[PDB]
Amino acid sequence: GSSCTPGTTFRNRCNTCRCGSNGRSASCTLMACPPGSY
Ligand SMILES: [Co+2]
């Protein structure tokens, strides 16, 4: 838990994220995600 697979991308609601080298952070888009956006 509290982790991602390094260098993977993943989705969180309407946002997309790229997992850091450490697996402990991710670079994510910051879009507001209203209903229907995902
Ligand atoms: Co963990």
* 16, part of any domain: yes
Query: Is position 34 within any domain?
Result: no
Q: Which domain holds residue 22?
A: 1-29
Any residues with CB less than 8 A from the CB of 2 and at least 6 apart, and which?
24
Experimental method: X-ray
Q: In 1-38, where do the E strands start and end?
A: 9-12, 15-19, 26-28
Q: Is residue 36 part of a domain?
A: no
Q: State the residue for tokens 């956006």.
A: 37
Distance 29 CA to ligand 1 centre (A): 23
Decide if 14 is inside a domain: yes
What's the gap in Å between 27 CA and the centre of ligand 1? 18
Residue 10 is which amino acid? F
In units of Å, what resolution does this entry have?
1.8
Say how many domains are in the chain: 1
- Which residues make Cβ contacts (< 8 Å) with residue 32, sequence separation at least 6? none
Answer whether 33's CB lies under 8 Å from 15's CB.
Answer: yes
Tell me, yes or no, whether 8 lies in a domain: yes
- Neighbouring residues of the ion ligand 1, judged by CB less than 5 Å: 1-3
- Please indicate, yes or no, if residue 35 is contained in any of the structural domains: no
CA of 1 to the centre of ligand 1 (A): 3
CB 18 within 8 A of CB 9: yes
Q: 13 in helix, strand or coil? A: coil
